[PDB]
Design a protein around this ligand. Sequence first.
Ligand SMILES: Cc1ncc(COP(=O)(O)O)c(CNc2cccc(C(=O)O)c2)c1O
Ligand SMILES: Cc1ncc(COP(=O)(O)O)c(CNc2cccc(C(=O)O)c2)c1O
Lengths: 427, 427
Amino acid sequence: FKTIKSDEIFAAAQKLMPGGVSSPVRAFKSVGGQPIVFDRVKDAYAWDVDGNRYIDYVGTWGPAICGHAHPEVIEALKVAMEKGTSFGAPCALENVLAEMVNDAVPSIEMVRFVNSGTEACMAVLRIMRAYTGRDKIIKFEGCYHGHADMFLVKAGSGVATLGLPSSPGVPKKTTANTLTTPYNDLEAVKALFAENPGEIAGVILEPIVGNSGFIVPDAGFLEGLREITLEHDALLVFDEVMTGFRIAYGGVQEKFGVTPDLTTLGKIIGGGLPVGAYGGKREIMQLVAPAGPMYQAGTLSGNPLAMTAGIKTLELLRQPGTYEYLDQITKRLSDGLLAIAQETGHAACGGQVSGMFGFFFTEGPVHNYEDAKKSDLQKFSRFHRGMLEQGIYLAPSQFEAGFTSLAHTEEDIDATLAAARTVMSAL
Amino acid sequence: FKTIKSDEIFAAAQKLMPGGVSSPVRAFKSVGGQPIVFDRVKDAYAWDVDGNRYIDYVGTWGPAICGHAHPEVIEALKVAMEKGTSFGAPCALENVLAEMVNDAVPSIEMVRFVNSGTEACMAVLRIMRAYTGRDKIIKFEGCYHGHADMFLVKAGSGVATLGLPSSPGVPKKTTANTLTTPYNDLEAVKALFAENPGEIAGVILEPIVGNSGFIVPDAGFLEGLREITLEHDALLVFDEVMTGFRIAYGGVQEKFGVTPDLTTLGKIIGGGLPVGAYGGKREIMQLVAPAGPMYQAGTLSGNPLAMTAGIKTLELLRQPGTYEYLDQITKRLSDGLLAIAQETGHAACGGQVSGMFGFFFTEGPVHNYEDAKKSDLQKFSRFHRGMLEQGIYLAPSQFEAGFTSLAHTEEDIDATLAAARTVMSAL
Ligand SMILES: Cc1ncc(COP(=O)(O)O)c(CNc2cccc(C(=O)O)c2)c1O
Ligand SMILES: Cc1ncc(COP(=O)(O)O)c(CNc2cccc(C(=O)O)c2)c1O
C-alpha cells in the first residue's frame, strides 16, 4: 500500500497551510496523522494521487449523494459555465432552485442562498435573535453548525474529536449567550428554559447527529423540543446541512414528521459546489435584508453554477426509488459491519437511516456525545487504517457519520464487508 | 428599453427569497427598485434576460477582473470537473493556489482557504483575538467585512446603501467589543487605544475603501495605523477581499507599501467561484486548527474547482501589463466622467486606482463615510437608471466602487463616456 505521493504533497502542504489542510478533520490527526491526497473521484470511488482506488464512504462529507462526478451534473455545469460563472445580479436559476427547495423542505417557505453551511448557520442564528428579540441560544454537546465567536461551544466535527470544547479564538463573553445541553436530554433543555425565562431565542440542533458519530434522536426527543419551544415562544431550528436531502428528500423533519421554524441546508444542495441555504416560516424570513433589517449578504450567493449543480442534483434525487436504494444498501452495510464485529469479538454499535450510517467501537448504545466518547479510538484508528489499505475510504474520525451514494453498488458493499471482516479479524 | 422579463422574474423571486434576491444590494432599492436579471455575461458585457446588452462595470462585484467567462478559465474548469468538483480531502491544487497566494501577498506567509470573504473575515477576527488574547476590535465606519456579527457596526456596502442601522440579532455583548472610528481619522484611532489600554486585539480595515463608495486613504493613514498597532502590540488586518489582486497583484499592501499582520482575500481569488482566504504571519496562522487550538473548518474549502479557477485567474493576472492596462482605461473612464460632470454643471468628485474607481455626486472631496453620505443620491439614482438605458451597467449604489476588467476595451470606455455625456446632459 503505497502513499508516497500523498506524503510528499501533504508534507509540502503543511508549510503553506495550517496543518497542511483547508479543513481540520482532513489532517487525519484523530486516526494516525497520515492523510491521502485525492486526485479524482467518480461514482462511489476515489483515487489516490498514488493510483490507489478506494470505495468512498465520505462522499466529500455529504454532497456526493448521487455519486461523485455524476455525468448529468457535470454536463449541466459544462453547459452553464459557457454563460459565465457569476453574475452579481439575479438570475433565473435562483428562482428554480429556490422553488425546488421550498417544495422539498416542509419548514421552508422562503429561502436565502448562501455559500456554505457555516454561512447558513451564522445567518439563522442571527434571525433567531432578530425575530425573537432574545439573545440566548440552546445547542447540544457534540452538534456542529459551523464556527464563530458566540456559538463555538462544545461543538462537533474537529471539535468533538480531541475533547475540544469551545473556542479558542472567541472572547470569554460571547459564548455566554449560548446554552449547551446533552443531546437527547429533554429534561436538561426544559431546565434551561426554566432557568432563563423570556431569554431563549430558540434551540438549534442536528435533527440526526452526524458530527459526534451517528446519533439518532430517542423517541419523543424532537417532538419534545418542538413542544417546549412553542411553549416559550422560542424557535426550533433544524441544522440539516448534513441530513438535508440525504435522510429524505425533505430531510429529517420530513422523515420523522417534526417541523422546525427555520432550517439550514448545505452540502447536497450545492451538488458538489459551495452552496448553503437557510429558510423557514415566511414571517421570519421577512426580516432578512433587503426585505427586512437583518443584514446578510454574499457576493457569490446564488451564482448560476451552484444553482445549476443544485438543481440537477435535486432532480436526480426525485427519481423513483432513490431513498429506498440508499436505505437498502446502507442497512446491508451497517448490519454487516455489526455482524462482523460480533463475529470477530469486538464490542460495537451503530445504525443507519437512509444513506447515513455510524459505527462505534463501544457496546453502547450511543445516545449522546458522552456515550460516543466511550468508543475505543485506539481500535478505530487501527480499523480505519486497515480499511484504507483494503481500499475502503472511511471518515478519518470516530465522530463523523459515514455516507452512502446512489453510485455505490451491492458489489461495493460486499467488497466493503469482505474488507471489514479481514480488518476486524486482526485488530 | 424593455425589462419585461426581468420584472417577471424579480416579481416571482420576491415570493421565494427575502427581497427576491440572494444579496441585499442586488435589489436596486436605492436606485429604482427594478433590478435587471442577468442571463449571461462575457468579457466586459452582461446580457439582460430581455436581450439588452450592457457594458458591465460591476464585474460580479470584483471577481471578473479578467473579464466574464474568460475562455482559459472556463476551459480549465471544464477539464477539472471531469475529476469531480469536491473531494473532502486534500488535493494538489490547494498547494498550488496556496503557494501562488503566499508569493503574491506580502503579509501572507501561510494561508487557509475558505468559501467567502465573510468566512475569511470571520475567521481572521477570531485569530486576532485568539492570538492577542484581547477582545476589542477597531473597524471603521463605512467599511464592510462580511456579515459576521462583530462586523455589523457602522457597516458599509448594503447596510449603507439601504440606510440600514447596525443589524439586529447580534447580542449587545458581542457588538460591545467592536470599536469604531471614522476612516482616515488617525486621531480617533489613537484615542481608542488610549481609552482601552491592553484591550485592543487590532484594527481591521479596507486598505482602500470600496463599500462606502471609492475612498483612498489620506497620506500617512495606513502608515499611522501600522505604527500605532505595533506600539500597542495590536494586529493590523487588511481586508483585501475587494482590493486584493485588483489594486495590484499584491493588493493595496503591495501598492502602498504597508504590510499588515493578517489579510483577508476573496472574489478574484475564486475566479468566479465561491472562494475566500485569510493568511498572514506564520506565528499567527499557527493557531488555526488543526495546527493550533482555534477551530475553523469548511466542507467545501479548498475544493478542486475553486482552486482551479483561482489558479487560472492569478496566472492571467501575472501576464505583462495587466495592471498598467487597468489603470490606463480606468483613469480615462474616471477623468472622462468627471470632465463630463464639470461640463454638464454637476458637482462631482471621484478617483481611481487600477481597475477600481468611484464617482460621487458631491463636490467633496470624500475622505470618509460621512463625506460620502453628502452625495446627491436622488441624482445618482437618475444617473444610474439613465446609464442602464444607454446600455451601461453600474453598481446600483452610490456606496459601491465600480470595476474595470482586462476585457474592457478603449471602445467600451468611449461608449461609456458617450453614454455618460448623454445622461448627465439631462438629469
Ligand atoms: C450539521 C452541520 N451543520 C453545519 C455544517 C457546516 O457546513 P460547511 O462546512 O459547508 O460550512 C456541517 C459540516 N459537516 C462536516 C463534517 C465533517 C468535516 C467538515 C469539515 O469542515 O471539514 C464538515 C454540519 O455537519
Ligand atoms: C472589503 C470586503 N470584505 C469582505 C466582503 C465579503 O465577502 P463575501 O461577500 O464573499 O461574503 C466584501 C464584499 N463586497 C461586496 C460588495 C457588493 C455586493 C456584495 C453582496 O453581498 O451582494 C458584496 C468586501 O467588499
